[model samples]
Target chain A: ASKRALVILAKGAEEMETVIPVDVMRRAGIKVTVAGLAGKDPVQCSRDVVICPDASLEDAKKEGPYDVVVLPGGNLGAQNLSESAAVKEILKEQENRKGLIAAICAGPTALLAHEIGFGSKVTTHPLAKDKMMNGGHYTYSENRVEKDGLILTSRGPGTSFEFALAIVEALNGKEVAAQVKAPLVLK
Target chain B: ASKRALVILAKGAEEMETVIPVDVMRRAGIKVTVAGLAGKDPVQCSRDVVICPDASLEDAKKEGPYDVVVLPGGNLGAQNLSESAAVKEILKEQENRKGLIAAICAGPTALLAHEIGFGSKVTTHPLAKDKMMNGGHYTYSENRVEKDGLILTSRGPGTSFEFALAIVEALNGKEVAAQVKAPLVLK
Candidate 1:
């Protein structure tokens, strides 16, 4: 498999957390596709930077299969991502096929909210914990990555690279992830 | 002149604070050197994984007739950046040269500690007000960038893109900066 992954971009996505991971994962040889919510032409960051998506909810639904589903953390973005019933539909249907699902910061709250994270250990932006309390157990790691089963979670914008690195690791290998860090001189 | 900037790298440099500005600046034709405190190869994030710097402190100091000095914040990264006497010295020299001195998030503490921001209108990572209270005038904004004379600052990772855009605008111009953001589809 070429390792195709769907990175969903909601209305208010964190710019770095969304783009950094997508860029790094693609660099690691994961075919990463960016999808926007509700056919929004450009998904704007919390900072008001608008990024055009590779596809929309309708397009994603029409396409059918994908390998991994990645959600990035942003207060409004996460809320909008969860609000789309299609995202919930995708999570409910696609999670069973060894489909690794990852959410970072506030993004995980949305995942948990849609009942996609039930029984999966997860993490989120610190302020989001109170909301995720009911979905699963939480282990606090200010770090970007928390892997429990097929669900991966990250803390916040501060953790963007680590968040991306973890996804690259899942798709490629630790070596590939390690290589991604090499330009930054990461060991 | 080829613009040169000194960026501090340590365990926990906010990925966006460091990477985005560096990337955006480079795309605008400026040269950015990721310098580490020592000769350490791989520096860690505050939480997970390690990041490597492009140059060591000794090499950066000797090689530079740098035009500016910037510190990227991740709190712990700022703490590590502040401990360096070399950083302090370079900052002092830049003051006389009228070169730009900038920091973001907790990184602005470097300006105050070096006494460059005394009584200057400044902004920083939201919770960092107390840190800026020493010899610095504090202001608050969810806005992307803040300029206090030769010193520049920003609120948090939330402002990463705008902060980088500000740097591009300052060094290059609106045209080049717009190109950088436009490809990314930024507003």
Candidate 2:
């Protein structure tokens, strides 16, 4: 059986963070869905790269429960995800089912906003640390990538590969992740 | 002065390689245009990520003489670039103008097809070395990122940051590249 991944694509998302995991997870044979938060239109990312999603969030949610829910961060993109009622519902349900939930950079802040995985050790882009730690709900780490139970988090664009590989490891096991990582030429 | 970059996007292009450079360069304050090689429709990448290019290559070429021409690699994407007369002309013009020409993974192989930078030392994904060295026109290096004057090349997705940052250093100088690199949280 293939693992299914739902990657929420919102306006202003960090394109690198969003693309890296989606590409890597697919390499690991995960059925990855890049679901647009604001319907199925091209999303202009923080750096202005436009990505067309596979389906709208509304449509994708009906296809769940995915093995993992991914959130890619950009300041405004994370804000969009954080403010979306639809995203909130997906994360909450994924949490309730004990499925993996991964977020990167400011993305972890969406977890804070949705009140999912409180008290998990996580990491975010340094500039977003204050925002992610607004309350004492989650313990923040400076590590590049952190995994706590079902919740996985990573820092910024530079850490995206590591973040993605971590997700691969969680879903497909070490052997599959290693096989995928070798070809990427990661140092 | 802002540095201008033209990234040629083709079907089957590695989404990670394509997005990483564009996003990182934009962060470095470079003006990057993701131009579709075929037309202005969204491109389906190697792992199925769909990227909407900024403009068609035919139209973008009218702008002329960019600071850098970037090529992102996927097996089929490189073959597309290799087969395009437009790409050959673009690389030749860039070479004639002595502008920086950067390609990664299988991307450098396209340079071979067009007979650009024949003697320059470059690097490509290990799997691509044989194809790139078919006639021994260019020297191959094992380095993650290799730059020989106006010709710059890198290995694969893992080396994309290094490749992008090297371009930044070339266009914007070491200080700007360093500034842009810090926030990426690259390990």
Candidate 3:
């Protein structure tokens, strides 16, 4: 059976962070869903790149229990994700199932907001450190991409490819990740 | 005055290559226009990510004399760029004006089609080498991002950040490029 992954896309999301992971995961042969947070309308990302999602979250949620749920980061975008009751529910369910929940840049702050994985070692964009450490709930690391159990986190846009390939390694395994990495010309 | 960039977005464009450059350039304070080759409708990229262009190429060309013009590549996307009479004129006009032109992956192949910049050393995703070198019209190199005068080319997704920052350096100067590069966390 093919692995399924869900990427929740919101307005103000970092377009580079969103697209890199989605593109890489698809390359790894994962059935990835880029679900729009707000209905089916086009999403205006942090850099103003517009992306039309594969499906709205409302529709995509019914097909859940995805192997991994990805959260992309922009400050306002992460704030939107943190405020969503639907997102909270999804995170809790994924956590309960012990499924992988990967986030990058400020995206990890949403994990903190939803209380998805307390005590997990994580990382975020350096500018977002204060927010992620608000209550000292999760230990912080400076690693570009940090994984503690099912929760995987990475830093800013520069680390997106590393973040994505990490997710690929987790879901599809090391060999697949390395295979995908070779052609990308990653340093 | 801020630099303005025009990125031609065609169906089957590599979403990573397209989005990375646009986002990075905007970070450097460049006013970037993601113009659709097929009008303003959403473009389906190589990995199936759909992007909505800022405007149609037909309309954007009228507003040009841009600082730089970018071409992103996926095989089909490059073909679309290569075959478009409009693209040929756009590249020719930019060339005549000595404006910077950047292309990535299969994108540089479009340069070949339009006979844009012969004798400039360039690089492309390895798979695209044969097509780009079909006539030996341009000199080739293996640099992650190759710049030969106003023409810039890069390899694949992994090199997008480098490709984008090089464009930033070209248009905004080294200081602005360095400042923008810091947050991206690229190697």
* Residue runs of model 2 more than 4 Å from their true location after superposition: none
TM-score of each: 0.55, 0.99, 0.99
Question: Residue-wise lDDT of candidate 3 within B23-98, one digit each (tens)?
Answer: 9999999999999999989999999999999999999988857999999989899999999999999999899999
True-structure Cα RMSD, model 3: 0.8
Q: Rank the candidates by DockQ, best first.
A: 2, 3, 1
The fnat scores of all predictions, in order, read: 0.03, 0.97, 0.93
Clashing pairs in 1: A105-A125, A185-B52, A186-B52, B11-B44, B12-B45, B12-B46
Instruction: Please provide, for model 1 over B1-187, each residue's C-alpha lDDT reduced to its tens digit, 9 standing for 90 to 100.
Output: 7777777776666656776777667667788787877774656544332345777877888874676677888778888777778878888887877888878888888777767656667788767877678533555444457886777787765566677778778877799888876544332
Query: Which segments of candidate 1 are over 4 A away from where they belong?
Result: A1-187, B135-143
Candidate 1 chain A lowest-lDDT run of ten: A135-144
List model 2 lDDT by residue over A1-187, tens digit each. Answer: 9999999999999999999999999999999999999899999999999999999999999995999999999999999999999999999899999999999999999999999998898999999888788988889899999999999999999899899999999999999999999999987
Chain A, model 1: TM: 0.90
Output the number of the DockQ-best candidate. 2
Q: Candidate 1 chain B — worst ten consecutive residues by lDDT sum? A: B43-52
lDDT score, candidate 2: 0.94
Candidate 2 lDDT score at position A74: 96
Q: List the residue pairs that clash in candidate 3.
A: A158-B184
